[PDB]
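Weekly sync, protein design subgroup
Attendees: M.S., D.O., the rotation student, P.L. (late)

Item 1: inverse folding check
M.S. brought a backbone from last month's batch and wanted to see whether the design step gives back something sensible before we order anything. D.O. pointed out we never logged the input encoding, so this time it goes straight into the notes. Structure tokens as presented (527 positions):
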């Protein structure tokens, strides 16, 4: 690289450029004694450096803005259009230039770190991203989370997107510009740039490119999925969806199946690819006994975020005093049982939707039709003891297009692959007790070995769910959710409650023909 290349973006008076720093260099930079404030890092007794992000201990959706221009006007899922509430707020082009200026002026006159990286593991569809920061640990974060180019890949590197982290600056003009606060996370799809002002939260630097991939990929026929994915010895790929607490991490961890990734995947002509080169894992209440793989990944080149470090250098993983959203990032190879050397594989042939049904209504396992796959993907239901949660596509926060556009391309890719979707209740049954980890692992086994795709089924009323009549390794009595109620009538009363919740939630998608058509595939009330 060269200083003059950064001049193209508006930055000037560059002091020194640290380009694609090594992990050893980043460690030395992070302990620099001249650092102040939230730039500072400390070494823990696990070998990983720890940093603090100030008041922003999570994403700031209320500060998220996307320029509305000729590129995005008729394509983006805007906050101020349609039925579905979202945080994709339109930004004027002129305010964008002001925000860009704030960031590029902040990054002028500075020593800068520049990290070139990829979003997407498949070369023919991946995004080349250039990240610019004045803070070494921010550069470390993006080195962990995106895919690290080889020296030979850097020779021909041409950025498709620029991410400029100006966490040290804020926007004094925010009120008269009609913005939410002096902070901002702003995107321009004409200039292909992301700006970060004010917030030091690491996740803004990964979830911004997730949001942009979530715009670009479906528009070119590539599915985007908030899922884990893993691959068997025979190369058979499975994807697992589920909100927090549904067992997604546990059920996709299997010594005989290598992990493609844990967070965000694409699905193109060649198969399923990881967006990321690393993992950004929650660490509240972490223990070596409960999460041995994550714990073991916390070593030199991991980066701890907002964890409590004691005066003796030890970590109190139980302390949520600053935030419950403590995190660690690490490059993906800190996990042993992964797909390597490239985080991608062939086409998924099993799609597993996990839900913790606190109502005790849904079967432990059902085989979905294509329309039910779209319906339950859009619903993204789970519950806790019972309060429901619905989140479109199992993650609404990073959707740049209408949710139905994600459902359509997912099922298109499934149909071309002959993939079958299953809905799995890892929550509760009629006895008020949770379904056992032993039972759900046996269900996953039976799904993944293909034994249910053409198995005999009976149909559950109201939800119209195809349930296998028998399932190897599981007590047959558990398969019908009605069998844990005193009478079928007692199940029906709760099923009517839950069906109404789905129907009410789904209504906000019916402003598109895809969503309106899918009502007829949804749960039915009793008549």
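Designed sequence read out in the meeting:
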């Amino acid at each position: 690289l060269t200083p003059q290349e950064l001049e193209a973006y508006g930055i000037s008076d560059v002091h020194d450029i640290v380009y694609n720093p090594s992990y050893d260099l980043l460690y030395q930079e992070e302990l620099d004694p001249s650092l102040t404030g939230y730039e500072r890092g400390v070494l823990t007794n696990l070998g990983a450096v720890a940093v603090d992000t100030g008041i922003f201990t999570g994403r700031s959706p209320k500060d998220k803005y996307i320029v509305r221009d000729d590129t995005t006007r008729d394509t983006f899922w805007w906050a101020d259009k349609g039925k579905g509430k979202n945080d994709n707020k339109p930004l004027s082009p002129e305010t964008w230039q002001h925000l860009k200026g704030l960031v590029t002026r902040q990054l002028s006159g500075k020593r800068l770190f520049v990290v070139d990286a990829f979003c997407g593991a498949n070369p023919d569809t991946r995004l080349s991203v250039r990240f610019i920061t004045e803070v070494a640990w921010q550069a470390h974060f993006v080195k962990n989370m995106f895919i690290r180019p080889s020296d030979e890949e850097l020779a021909g590197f041409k950025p498709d997107f620029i991410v400029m982290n100006g966490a040290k600056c804020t926007n004094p003009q925010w009120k008269e510009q009609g913005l939410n606060s002096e902070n901002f996370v702003a995107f321009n799809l004409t200039e292909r740039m992301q700006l970060i002002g004010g917030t030091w939260y690491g996740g803004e630097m990964i979830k911004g490119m997730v949001s942009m991939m979530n715009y670009l990929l479906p528009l070119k026929g590539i599915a985007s999925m908030h899922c884990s994915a893993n691959v068997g010895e025979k190369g058979d790929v499975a994807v697992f969806f589920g909100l927090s607490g549904t067992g997604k991490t546990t059920l996709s961890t299997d010594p005989k199946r290598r992990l493609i990734g844990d967070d965000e995947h694409g699905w193109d002509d060649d198969g399923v690819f990881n967006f990321e080169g690393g993992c950004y894992a929650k660490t509240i209440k972490l223990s070596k006994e409960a999460e041995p793989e994550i714990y073991n990944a916390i070593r030199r080149d991991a980066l701890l975020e907002n964890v409590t470090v004691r005066e003796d250098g030890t970590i109190d993983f139980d302390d949520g005093s600053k935030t419950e959203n403590t995190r660690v990032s690490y490059p993906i190879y800190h996990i042993d049982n992964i797909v390597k050397p490239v985080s991608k594989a062939g086409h998924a042939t099993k799609v597993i939707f996990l839900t913790a049904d606190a109502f005790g209504v849904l079967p432990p396992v059902s085989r979905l039709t294509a329309d039910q796959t779209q319906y339950h993907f859009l619903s993204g239901f789970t519950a806790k003891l019972p309060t429901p949660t619905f989140s479109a596509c199992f993650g609404a926060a990073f959707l740049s297009l209408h949710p139905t556009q994600y459902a359509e391309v997912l099922v298109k890719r499934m149909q071309a692959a002959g993939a079958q979707a299953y809905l799995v209740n890892t929550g509760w049954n009629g006895t008020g007790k949770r379904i056992s980890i032993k039972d759900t692992r046996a269900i996953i086994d039976a799904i993944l070995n293909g034994s249910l795709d053409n198995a005999e089924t009976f149909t559950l009323p109201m939800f119209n769910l195809a349930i296998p009549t028998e399932l190897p390794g599981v007590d047959t009595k558990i398969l019908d959710p009605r069998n844990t109620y005193a009478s079928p009538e007692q199940w029906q009363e709760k099923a009517e409650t839950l069906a109404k919740l789905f129907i009410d939630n789904f209504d906000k998608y019916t402003d598109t023909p895809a969503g309106a058509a899918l009502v007829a595939a949804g749960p039915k009330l009793h008549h």
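Discussion: The domain at 1-36+62-221 is CATH 3.40.449.10 (Phosphoenolpyruvate Carboxykinase; domain 1). The two ends are 69 Å apart (CA to CA).
Action: P.L. to compare against the previous round before Friday.
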